Design a protein around this ligand. Structure first.
Ligand SMILES: *[C@@H]1O[C@H](CO)[C@@H](O[C@@H]2O[C@H](CO)[C@@H](O[C@H]3O[C@H](CO)[C@@H](O)[C@H](O)[C@@H]3O)[C@H](O)[C@H]2NC(C)=O)[C@H](O)[C@H]1NC(C)=O
Ligand SMILES: *[C@@H]1O[C@H](CO)[C@@H](O[C@@H]2O[C@H](CO)[C@@H](O)[C@H](O)[C@H]2NC(C)=O)[C@H](O)[C@H]1NC(C)=O
Ligand SMILES: *[C@@H]1O[C@H](CO)[C@@H](O)[C@H](O)[C@H]1NC(C)=O
Ligand SMILES: *[C@@H]1O[C@H](CO)[C@@H](O)[C@H](O)[C@H]1NC(C)=O
Ligand SMILES: *[C@@H]1O[C@H](CO)[C@@H](O)[C@H](O)[C@H]1NC(C)=O
Lengths: 73, 298, 79, 313
């Protein structure tokens, strides 16, 4: 039994071991690239909203105010 | 002309007490106004008034034409750019002009890497054989050159076939000497063309060619000289070594076609920071003439 | 001197433009101050036959396109 | 009857077709050509096979009926030698076996062009794979261009065409030669105005003329087109003979003018790299070559000596 450890960062979530732990997992710890803030048909909502320079609505900014990242990362 | 200018001139001539002001590009301004700035209602590209707006003053940035069409469809969906205008490539993942009607031959499975601007489209549609056979001069970025120079056959006052003649003899366009010795009866003609390439009003300047390798005739020294001369004459005509920018065209339109909003600009030609409506509110404006989302009142 | 040499009957009404001049309203509601336009034209002429102007081009071309897309913007950032 | 052969590509009208004599065919058993076998009187059978052809016009263009009976539906098997000229005399039909009554599809034109051809900014093309060289001196230049665009649209394998002069030394004649592979395309106009690496016979600079390629259109060239690759490099270039440089040891200075660009496509990335490396190795003046993978083509750029040392104690 073993549990893999990563200057790099583990792309996959940590887990201990049988199973084939993924080799090509640990890689570059990228930097934050999106901030978003949440406020309380959706197409109509967004249309009338953005027309003013802008229910669950979020303004995510690719580079309150919590950080995230671009989808697929 | 366009779907608007017809309605606009009909209102102006008939004096019917509302003139549907529309910006250069001949498309209805998103927020029309009444004969005395009483009730500015906003419309769509069709030309009707949206039911949910009649407020006196100026509507709070009424919804754009792309998104108006989209929400109309809801009761393919266009992808309206953040500015409110159509994204240059709708998504079959074809791409569209700056009007909403798809560019003719651009139906593809995936997004085209880069599909044509307006001048490239007009050139290609010309090669198909619809329109006077004189290619509009396109800027490197693809938009229309501000100064469009089309030659004219002096006899019969018929435009001089330029695609064919340049195709056959572009040795003949090396200098003005060769052109004269090949087409002695052709007298150039340069005008200012707006964003849509439409010859502006009473700005054509019928040059002469009597007394004065590349491709496309927009890179020939002939065209460069023939538009440098046009800009030199325009300096005397109007003090500015350039054709009237989009702003000044809108200005002259509003001044002539009396309606309450008249944009403001200064000799540099760009939109002044703050545009003000007589009998109404002021607001900052960006370089492209669109009102900033909210500024109604370094 | 062009009014007969190069500029010719087209669509601008040189007749009207001159009828307010010697032989104001302008092309597109442009107030025209004829004397200033002529002075600017001679300014540009003497400016273009100027030994230093060439050098300016040789430098204006060098500056990276990112900070100045076209030579006009090069010039504005030099001002 | 008994259609749907095991090995066949998948996924009034008698006069509609233009029968062609059999002598124009080069028999070749060791040839690759998709088809659709069948095992069908005679005239009724001919009409049946031609109706079946018109039923699925996506790729049926060389319908042939024999009596030894069968009838197959080849695609346009008119491979042309990659020589620029105003005649299909270099084009020769290559079929598995001489049929008896080979016909072909009359080229039907249109009024609407399916796609928007964007002209390549490259005067020179090497390794082209011509499909159908056509003369066009009869028509006017714009009408000829429209016919050329329509011709390439009607060809599902055409990946671009060329509307250009040929034999300009003799006077030149306009031709619409359609390509199924643009090959290594070089000798641009805006790039390498100084420091050129690489044709009076042909002339593609005047406005209508050029090397138009239909939009990138990632349809993957439906899988019945003739597989086409650049001609194999007779010389073998050893990548170990070239120093690969990390991207950190280079400046991205624009306004650098002593370079020249080329595009490829057509072959696996390694093949394109070897092609561009050999192209630069031919010239002692090229010193560094950089390849980047653009969507449709791969762009290799050749720069001369361009290094900016910064000195300090
Ligand atoms: C590509 O070759 C083209 C062949 O069509 C060629 O067009 C031909 O050009 C010649 C002149 O270069 C025309 O001949 C005309 O000009 C001569 C000049 O002395 C006159 O004596 C003749 O009477 C005539 O007016 C041809 O007529 C023309 N082709 C046709 C079918 O008329 C293009 O010049 C070539 N393009 C390039 C870039 O070279
Ligand atoms: C005004 O214009 C005329 C016509 O262009 C000028 O006459 C020309 O002068 C140039 C030299 O500058 C000669 O090369 C041309 O042959 C002349 N053309 C003709 C038709 O005579 C004239 O010099 C200009 N100046 C004045 C004061 O008239
Ligand atoms: C201009 O019109 C005349 C009509 O007399 C025509 O013969 C001539 O061909 C036209 N110009 C040229 C250069 O063809
Ligand atoms: C403008 O030009 C026309 C001919 O194009 C001429 O008849 C008219 O007199 C000119 N305008 C004036 C006010 O003279
Ligand atoms: C690319 O294809 C050629 C074909 O022979 C082959 O020699 C070469 O090794 C291939 N490279 C890769 C990475 O497949």
């Amino acid at each position: 039994a073993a549990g893999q450890r990563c200057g790099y960062r583990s792309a996959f979530p940590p887990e201990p071991l049988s199973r084939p732990p993924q080799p090509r997992a640990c890689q570059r710890p990228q930097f934050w690239q999106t901030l978003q803030t949440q406020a309380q048909f959706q197409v109509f909502l967004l249309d009338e909203l953005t027309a003013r320079g802008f229910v669950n609505i979020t303004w995510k900014l690719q580079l309150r105010t919590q950080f995230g990242c671009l989808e697929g990362f | 002309l366009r779907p608007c200018e017809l309605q606009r001139e009909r209102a102006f001539l008939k004096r019917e007490d509302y003139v549907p002001q529309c910006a250069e590009d001949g498309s209805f301004q998103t927020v029309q106004c009444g004969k005395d700035g009483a009730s500015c209602w906003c419309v769509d590209a069709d030309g009707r008034e949206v039911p949910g707006s009649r407020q006196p003053g100026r509507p709070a940035a009424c919804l754009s034409f792309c998104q108006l069409q989209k929400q109309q469809i809801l009761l393919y969906l266009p992808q309206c750019q953040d500015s409110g205008d159509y994204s240059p490539v709708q998504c079959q993942c074809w791409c569209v002009d700056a009007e909403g009607m798809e560019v003719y031959g651009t139906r593809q499975q995936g997004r085209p890497a880069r599909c044509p601007r307006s001048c490239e489209i007009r050139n290609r549609r010309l090669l198909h054989g619809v329109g006077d056979r004189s290619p509009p001069q396109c800027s490197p970025d693809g938009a229309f050159r501000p100064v469009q120079c089309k030659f004219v056959n002096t006899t019969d006052m018929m435009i001089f076939d330029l695609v064919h003649s340049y195709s056959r003899f572009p040795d003949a366009f090396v200098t003005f000497s060769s052109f004269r010795s090949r087409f002695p009866e052709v007298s150039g003609y340069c005008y200012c063309a707006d964003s849509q390439g439409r010859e502006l009003a009473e700005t054509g300047l019928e040059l002469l060619l009597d007394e004065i390798l590349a491709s496309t005739f927009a890179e020939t020294t002939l065209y460069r000289i023939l538009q440098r001369r046009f800009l030199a004459v325009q300096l005397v005509i109007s003090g500015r070594f350039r054709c009237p920018t989009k702003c000044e065209v809108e200005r002259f339109a509003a001044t002539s076609f009396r309606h309450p909003y008249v944009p403001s600009c200064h000799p540099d030609g760009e939109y002044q920071a703050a545009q003000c409506q007589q009998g109404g509110p002021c607001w900052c404006v960006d370089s492209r003439g669109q009102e900033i989302p909210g500024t109604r009142q370094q | 001197n062009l009014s007969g040499a190069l500029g010719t009957r087209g669509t601008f009404n040189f007749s009207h433009f001159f009828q307010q001049l010697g032989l104001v309203v302008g092309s597109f509601g442009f107030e025209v101050n004829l004397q200033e336009n002529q002075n600017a034209l001679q300014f540009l002429s003497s400016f273009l036959e100027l030994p230093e102007f060439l050098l300016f081009l040789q430098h204006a071309i060098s500056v990276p396109e990112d900070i100045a897309r076209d030579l006009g913007d090069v010039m504005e950032m030099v001002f | 009857v008994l259609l749907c052969h095991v090995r066949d590509w998948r996924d009034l009208t008698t006069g509609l077709f233009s029968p062609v004599d059999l002598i124009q065919v080069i028999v070749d058993g060791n040839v690759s050509l998709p088809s659709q076998q069948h095992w069908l009187s005679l005239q009724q059978a001919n009409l049946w096979c031609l109706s079946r052809c018109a039923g699925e016009p996506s790729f049926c263009q060389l319908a042939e009926v024999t009596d030894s009976f069968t009838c197959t539906l080849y695609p346009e098997a008119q491979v042309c030698d990659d020589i620029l000229e105003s005649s299909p005399k270099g084009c020769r039909l290559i079929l598995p076996r001489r049929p008896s009554a080979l016909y072909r599809k009359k080229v039907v034109l249109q009024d609407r062009v399916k796609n928007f051809y964007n002209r390549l900014p490259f005067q020179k093309l090497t390794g082209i794979s011509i499909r159908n060289k056509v003369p066009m001196s009869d028509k006017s230049i714009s009408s000829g261009f429209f016919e050329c665009e329509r011709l390439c649209d009607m060809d599902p394998c055409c990946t671009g065409f060329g509307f250009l002069n040929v034999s300009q030394l003799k006077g030149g004649e306009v031709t619409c030669l359609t390509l199924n592979s643009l090959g290594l395309q070089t000798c641009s106009e805006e790039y390498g105005g100084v420091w050129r690496i690489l044709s009076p016979d042909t002339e593609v600079r005047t406005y209508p003329f050029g090397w138009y390629q239909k939009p990138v259109s990632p349809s993957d060239a439906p899988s019945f087109c003739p597989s086409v690759a650049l001609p194999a490099l007779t010389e073998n270039v050893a990548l170990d003979s070239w120093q690969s440089l990390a991207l950190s040891s280079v400046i991205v200075d624009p306004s650098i003018r002593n370079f020249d660009v080329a595009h490829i496509s057509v072959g696996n990335f390694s093949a394109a790299r070897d092609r561009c490396l050999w192209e630069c190795s031919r010239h002692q003046d090229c010193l560094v070559t950089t390849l980047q993978t653009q969507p449709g083509a791969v762009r290799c750029m050749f720069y001369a000596d361009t290094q900016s040392c910064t000195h300090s104690l």
